[PDB]
Amino acid sequence: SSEIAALKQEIAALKKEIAALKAGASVQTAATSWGTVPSIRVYTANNGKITERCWDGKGWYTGAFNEPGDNVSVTSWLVGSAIHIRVYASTGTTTTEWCWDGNGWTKGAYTAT
Amino acid sequence: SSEIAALKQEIAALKKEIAALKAGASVQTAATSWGTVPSIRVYTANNGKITERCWDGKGWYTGAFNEPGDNVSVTSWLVGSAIHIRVYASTGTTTTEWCWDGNGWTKGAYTAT
Amino acid sequence: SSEIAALKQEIAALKKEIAALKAGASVQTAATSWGTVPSIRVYTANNGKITERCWDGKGWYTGAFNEPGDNVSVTSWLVGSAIHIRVYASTGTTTTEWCWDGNGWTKGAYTAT
Numbered sequence: 639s640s641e642i643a644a645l646k647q648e649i650a651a652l653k654k655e656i657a658a659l660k661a662g663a664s665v666q667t668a669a670t671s672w673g674t675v676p677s678i679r680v681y682t683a684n685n686g687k688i689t690e691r692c693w694d695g696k697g698w699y700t701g702a703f704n705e706p707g708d709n710v711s712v713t714s715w716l717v718g719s720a721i722h723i724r725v726y727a728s729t730g731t732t733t734t735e736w737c738w739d740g741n742g743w744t745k746g747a748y749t750a751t
Numbered sequence: 752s753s754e755i756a757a758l759k760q761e762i763a764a765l766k767k768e769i770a771a772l773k774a775g776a777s778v779q780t781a782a783t784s785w786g787t788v789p790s791i792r793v794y795t796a797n798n799g800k801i802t803e804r805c806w807d808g809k810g811w812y813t814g815a816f817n818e819p820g821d822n823v824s825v826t827s828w829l830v831g832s833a834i835h836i837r838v839y840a841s842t843g844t845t846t847t848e849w850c851w852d853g854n855g856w857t858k859g860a861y862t863a864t
Numbered sequence: 865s866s867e868i869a870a871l872k873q874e875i876a877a878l879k880k881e882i883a884a885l886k887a888g889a890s891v892q893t894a895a896t897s898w899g900t901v902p903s904i905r906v907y908t909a910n911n912g913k914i915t916e917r918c919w920d921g922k923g924w925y926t927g928a929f930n931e932p933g934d935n936v937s938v939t940s941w942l943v944g945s946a947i948h949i950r951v952y953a954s955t956g957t958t959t960t961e962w963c964w965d966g967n968g969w970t971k972g973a974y975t976a977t
């Protein structure tokens with residue numbers, strides 16, 4: 639019947655659309671750096687978790703940052719030689735700020751409101 | 752019939768794929784900062800609109816920036832004490848540059864070409 | 865029959881969900897800047913390719929950077945007057961670092977591990 643043949647091309651069209659959406663998919667990164675060496679921190683949202691990779695001039699290694707998020711952005715600044723980093727990790731519509739200030743990642747005051 | 756049973760598992764498979772796509776979805780953020788206080792600006796693309804949240808050392812508040820976009824990136828620089836911000840808001844394939852230079856957001860010269 | 869009418873509303877619901885996913889889609893940008901002029905570089909992931917647009921104070925032009933990627937982030941730093949840029953281009957779960965250090969884009973040591 640042409641009733642079943644119609645829906646068989648309907649699902650075929652939906653497979654073309656879903657495959658186009660899946661084509662664009664990838665991990666999401668954010669990067670910051672400081673000084674002249676330099677130091678570089680690269681944050682990667684992958685499968686709902688954000689991890690950190692670090693460079694201080696002598697090879698790449700995994701940093702202490704490990705939090706949930708499907709999206710990430712980062713900024714940092716120097717107070718003298720001391721580095722301060724702010725990572726904004728988002729899941730759904732909730733965005734949590736994470737703060738490095740010398741020894742450990744803490745939850746920041748940021749809200750979207 | 753096994754004709755109807757085939758399409759009933761076809762749509763069931765498409766529900767698994769669409770749910771996987773929706774799982775990764777979230778708001779998209781960009782951040783910049785300047786000075787030593789510091790000042791921080793956080794831009795959030797949510798539901799086709801980009802809004803701005805601000806920190807100058809004494810709590811978070813909503814900034815003047817409000818434009819359309821599903822994606823956002825930002826950079827900024829200091830000319831002395833004066834801050835200049837450039838926000839690149841994208842919808843589809845169109846990317847508009849927005850310029851802060853001391854009093855108001857203006858449309859920048861940027862084009863993708 | 866109500867067997868065919870059921871699947872005709874099933875596919876209708878999947879069209880609403882796919883259209884919501886396609887609504888959020890856009891090009892993805894990252895930006896960096898340096899100095900006081902300033903110089904600005906804007907990277908755009910579009911249809912699996914990342915291109916670069918440049919500003920050094922006298923109009924926008926297309927830069928040498930051209931690599932594959934569905935996601936992009938960037939950071940840069942000055943060693944004196946010399947600019948160094950690091951672009952992290954991601955496809956699927958693979959993230960390649962690209963390095964500008966004065967004459968040409970080279971593949972960087974970065975790995976996600």
Ligand SMILES: OC[C@H]1O[C@@H](O)[C@@H](O)[C@@H](O)[C@@H]1O
Pocket residue numbers: 679690692700701702703721738
């Ligand atoms: O030296 C490694 C450490 O560097 C700091 O700047 C932060 O990025 C930490 O998360 C990281 O573990």
Ligand SMILES: OC[C@H]1O[C@@H](O)[C@@H](O)[C@@H](O)[C@@H]1O
Pocket residue numbers: 724735737739745746747748788789806
């Ligand atoms: O020290 C913690 C505080 O640091 C500031 O720079 C901001 O990032 C605040 O949102 C944060 O709570």
Ligand SMILES: OC[C@H]1O[C@@H](O)[C@@H](O)[C@@H](O)[C@@H]1O
Pocket residue numbers: 792803805813814815816834851
């Ligand atoms: O002080 C608030 C103002 O700060 C400026 O740097 C910009 O971010 C404006 O959009 C904002 O309204």
Ligand SMILES: OC[C@H]1O[C@@H](O)[C@@H](O)[C@@H](O)[C@@H]1O
Pocket residue numbers: 837848850852858859860861901902919
């Ligand atoms: O002052 C306006 C101009 O400022 C420059 O720094 C660039 O961002 C231009 O694209 C913009 O049009």
Ligand SMILES: OC[C@H]1O[C@@H](O)[C@@H](O)[C@@H](O)[C@@H]1O
Pocket residue numbers: 905916918926927928929947964
């Ligand atoms: O002046 C143009 C050149 O500027 C450099 O800083 C890099 O961004 C190159 O990719 C670009 O071609």
Ligand SMILES: OC[C@H]1O[C@@H](O)[C@@H](O)[C@@H](O)[C@@H]1O
Pocket residue numbers: 675676693950961963965971972973974
């Ligand atoms: O000069 C090449 C090297 O430069 C460093 O700053 C890092 O970005 C390395 O990952 C890269 O391989």
